[PDB]
Design an enzyme around this catalytic site. Structure first.
Site, short mmCIF file in Angstrom:
data_model
loop_
_atom_site.label_atom_id
_atom_site.label_comp_id
_atom_site.label_asym_id
_atom_site.label_seq_id
_atom_site.Cartn_x
_atom_site.Cartn_y
_atom_site.Cartn_z
N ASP A 14 2.08 -9.97 -0.86
CA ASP A 14 1.12 -9.34 0.08
C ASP A 14 1.70 -8.21 0.93
O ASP A 14 0.99 -7.66 1.79
CB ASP A 14 0.49 -10.36 1.04
CG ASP A 14 -0.24 -11.47 0.31
OD1 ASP A 14 0.00 -12.65 0.65
OD2 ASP A 14 -1.05 -11.17 -0.59
N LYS A 17 3.15 -4.15 -2.64
CA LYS A 17 3.82 -3.57 -3.80
C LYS A 17 2.82 -2.95 -4.77
O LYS A 17 3.01 -1.84 -5.25
CB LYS A 17 4.66 -4.65 -4.50
CG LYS A 17 5.67 -5.29 -3.55
CD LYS A 17 6.50 -6.32 -4.25
CE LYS A 17 5.64 -7.50 -4.69
NZ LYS A 17 5.13 -8.26 -3.55
N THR A 18 1.74 -3.67 -5.05
CA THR A 18 0.74 -3.15 -5.98
C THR A 18 0.05 -1.92 -5.36
O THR A 18 -0.19 -0.92 -6.05
CB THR A 18 -0.29 -4.25 -6.34
OG1 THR A 18 0.39 -5.33 -6.98
CG2 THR A 18 -1.39 -3.70 -7.26
N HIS A 77 6.38 -13.61 -7.44
CA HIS A 77 7.80 -13.83 -7.29
C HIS A 77 8.46 -14.36 -8.59
O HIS A 77 9.50 -13.84 -8.99
CB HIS A 77 8.04 -14.78 -6.13
CG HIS A 77 9.47 -15.20 -5.98
ND1 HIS A 77 10.48 -14.31 -5.71
CD2 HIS A 77 10.05 -16.42 -6.10
CE1 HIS A 77 11.63 -14.96 -5.64
NE2 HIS A 77 11.40 -16.23 -5.88
N1 LIG Z 1 -3.84 -2.25 6.47
C1 LIG Z 1 -3.08 -2.10 5.36
N2 LIG Z 1 -3.27 -3.00 4.36
C2 LIG Z 1 -2.54 -2.90 3.23
C3 LIG Z 1 -1.54 -1.84 3.08
N3 LIG Z 1 -0.98 -2.00 1.87
C4 LIG Z 1 -1.57 -3.07 1.28
N4 LIG Z 1 -2.49 -3.61 2.10
C5 LIG Z 1 -3.34 -4.79 1.85
O1 LIG Z 1 -2.52 -5.96 1.85
C6 LIG Z 1 -2.93 -6.83 0.78
C7 LIG Z 1 -1.81 -7.07 -0.23
O2 LIG Z 1 -1.62 -5.87 -0.99
P1 LIG Z 1 -0.89 -5.86 -2.43
O3 LIG Z 1 -0.39 -4.48 -2.79
O4 LIG Z 1 -1.77 -6.40 -3.53
O5 LIG Z 1 0.35 -6.83 -2.09
P2 LIG Z 1 1.47 -7.25 -3.17
O6 LIG Z 1 1.41 -8.74 -3.38
O7 LIG Z 1 2.81 -6.93 -2.54
O8 LIG Z 1 1.31 -6.47 -4.46
C8 LIG Z 1 -4.10 -6.15 0.09
O9 LIG Z 1 -5.32 -6.63 0.65
C9 LIG Z 1 -3.94 -4.70 0.46
O10 LIG Z 1 -5.18 -4.00 0.41
C10 LIG Z 1 -1.39 -0.89 4.19
O11 LIG Z 1 -0.55 0.05 4.12
N5 LIG Z 1 -2.18 -1.09 5.27
MG LIG Z 2 0.81 -7.15 -6.29
#
Ligand SMILES: Nc1nc2c(ncn2[C@@H]2O[C@H](COP(=O)(O)OP(=O)(O)O)[C@@H](O)[C@H]2O)c(=O)[nH]1
Ligand SMILES: [Mg+2]
Lengths: 386, 181
Positions: A14, A17-18, A77
């Site tokens: 969360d 990364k994506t 992970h």
């Molecule tokens: N407010 C905010 N939310 C973000 C940002 N980047 C990601 N998110 C949100 O955080 C959540 C996790 O994002 P995701 O890229 O899928 O996390 P991952 O598990 O690392 O790939 C999602 O709901 C995104 O829309 C950001 O720069 N700002």
């Molecule tokens: Mg992801």
């Protein structure tokens, strides 16, 4: 002829990364033009599940004016652990994503540790979700925490580039935040050195087979893994038996004898003063003084699950499997971390391995663990010991 | 039209399907064949809507040394779990571009583009499991008395030839025909 660099995102779930992955490709495409897209339609025919490690990966590509990037992201992970230990592409650099709102979390630490262990050479940090923080002092605290964590695993925390950004706002096309993505790409360009081409490295050939030739002489075959071998050059024959030195007197390709063999080619190498009995499959030919034989090493290992076609039951400290390095199997014994009595299918652990005879190896060398030729594990030499 | 002996042929020595419980649809092909390639987009749009009670499998031709190389490449891609990514671009590379991917070495080179190391491609290409697949392919082809490609064999008892949408029209007729007893 844009240099090719492999990179990927790491960090806690969360943290973004994506979103960062999607943001980098979007911004770089709208700024410098998108990467060249190849033919890649996907077969609609149903595919039965096959034996082997299953790794969920997403890949994208994006270009800066001077470089071409191949970028891998994973959903979870467990997938990062597998991909880093035994994933299709070894990262030349990783982008560690850390959410300013959480600071470094358990998988932040774990991914850096893994990174050190499997030999990720460079890490750049993207401090994400800064759109949610109005508090420069907090941002500075999180950066200090990250730098100290990196340095704990011998990454140069004080020299690490750290970009403050928002992947989501950039992806949504907010110009101010888009600029931070370009800044990140700038650091990919400048902080990750262009990776060394195989042909430029010291010569190395993993010996696949050994033949007699010219009555009494000997020829060894394999694929030149790196560098160039030329007739008249000395080579060391490394691993399994005492290191020997010989002279290349010809490079055999098809039905002729050539003056050289280059990285990527399948060749036979004629060796002076070498009897057939003195050389065997699984040894390597190498530029003298560039690779050493070891019996003992530290490694990070992933053990396949039953579903991946690995072991059905756990193994214990007395387990004694085949370690497959380049072209041959070598038996070895293991030591588990203290406190650890058994290793389950699906586990990953640090493993200290002692082979029955030495193998040519450096830090970063990958290997398989097998039972009767069937892969049950995959590992990487983290540290050579003796 | 859907007439036995004209639009499809009834196999003289019908075989029993690989998986009981499903209606087997089995395509015999070679990556090097332009008629297979012409058939492919028709097969692809037919695959989009596979009925839940039919199993589709490809069985690449291997009756000779030339086609066997394509056949080994295919079974290898399946062994490694990448066929869904490689099948159409491999087909495209050979048939649209002029790429000479007709042996073990150039196939291995091609497969590096999909993460597959050449050593793993090579061990798989000549493994007993792939060799077994090749043998099974040849076994069926001799029993079904196929003389070439393309050919689509339904429930091990009907052969359908052709290279256009008539093929998938006749397949649907045969699939529905089987559904009754
Ligand atoms: N407010 C905010 N939310 C973000 C940002 N980047 C990601 N998110 C949100 O955080 C959540 C996790 O994002 P995701 O890229 O899928 O996390 P991952 O598990 O690392 O790939 C999602 O709901 C995104 O829309 C950001 O720069 N700002
Ligand atoms: Mg992801």
């Amino acid at each position: 002829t844009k240099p090719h660099v492999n990179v990927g995102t790491i960090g806690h779930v969360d943290h973004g990364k994506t979103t960062l992955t999607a943001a980098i490709t979007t911004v770089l495409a709208k700024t410098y033009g998108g990467a060249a897209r190849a033919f890649d339609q996907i077969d609609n025919a149903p595919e039965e599940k096959a034996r082997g490690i299953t790794i969920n990966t997403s890949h994208v590509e994006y270009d800066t004016p001077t470089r071409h990037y191949a970028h891998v992201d994973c959903p979870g992970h467990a997938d990062y652990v597998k991909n880093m230990i035994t994933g299709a592409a070894q990262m030349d650099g990783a982008i560690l994503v850390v959410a300013a709102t959480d600071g470094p979390m358990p998988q932040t630490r774990e991914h850096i540790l893994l990174g050190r262990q499997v030999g990720v050479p460079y890490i750049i940090v993207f401090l994400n979700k800064c759109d949610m923080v109005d508090d420069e002092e907090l941002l500075e605290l999180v950066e200090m925490e990250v730098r100290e964590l990196l340095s704990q695993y011998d990454f140069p925390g004080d020299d690490t580039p750290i970009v403050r950004g928002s992947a989501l706002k950039a992806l949504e096309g907010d110009a101010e935040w888009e600029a931070k993505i370009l800044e990140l790409a700038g650091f990919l360009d400048s902080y990750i050195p262009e990776p060394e081409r195989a042909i430029d490295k010291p010569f190395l050939l993993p010996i696949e087979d050994v033949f007699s030739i010219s009555g009494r002489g000997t020829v060894v075959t394999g694929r030149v893994e790196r560098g160039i071998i030329k007739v008249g050059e000395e080579v060391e024959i490394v691993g399994i038996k005492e290191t020997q030195k010989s002279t290349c007197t010809g490079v055999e390709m098809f039905r002729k004898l050539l003056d050289e063999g280059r990285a990527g080619e399948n060749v036979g190498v004629l060796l002076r003063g070498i009897k057939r009995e003195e050389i065997e499959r699984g040894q390597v030919l190498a530029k003298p003084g560039t690779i050493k034989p070891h019996t003992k090493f530290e490694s990070e290992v992933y053990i396949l699950s039953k579903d991946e076609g690995g072991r059905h039951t756990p193994f214990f400290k007395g387990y004694r499997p085949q370690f497959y390095f380049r072209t041959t199997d070598v038996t070895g014994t293991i030591e588990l971390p203290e406190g650890v009595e058994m290793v389950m299918p699906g586990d990953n652990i640090k493993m200290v391995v002692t082979l029955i005879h030495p193998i040519a190896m450096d830090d970063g060398l990958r290997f398989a663990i097998r039972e009767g030729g069937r892969t049950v594990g995959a590992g990487v030499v983290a540290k050579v010991l003796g | 039209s859907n007439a036995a002996g004209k639009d499809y042929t009834v196999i003289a020595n019908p075989g029993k399907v690989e998986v009981p419980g499903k209606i087997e649809v089995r395509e015999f092909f070679w990556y090097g064949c332009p008629h297979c390639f012409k058939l492919e987009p028709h097969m692809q749009t037919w695959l989009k809507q596979i009925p839940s009670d039919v199993r589709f499998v490809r069985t690449p031709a291997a009756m000779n040394k030339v086609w066997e190389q394509g056949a080994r490449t295919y079974y290898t891609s399946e062994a490694l779990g990448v066929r869904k990514r490689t099948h159409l671009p491999l087909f495209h590379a050979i048939q649209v571009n002029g790429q000479q991917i007709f042996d073990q070495a150039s196939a291995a080179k091609f497969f590096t583009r999909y993460g597959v190391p050449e050593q793993k491609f090579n061990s798989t290409y000549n493994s007993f499991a792939v060799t077994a697949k090749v043998a099974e392919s040849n076994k069926l082809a001799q029993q079904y008395q196929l003389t070439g490609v393309p050919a689509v064999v339904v429930n091990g008892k009907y052969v359908v030839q052709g290279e256009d949408g008539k093929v998938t029209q006749v397949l649907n007729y045969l699939i529905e025909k089987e559904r009754k007893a």
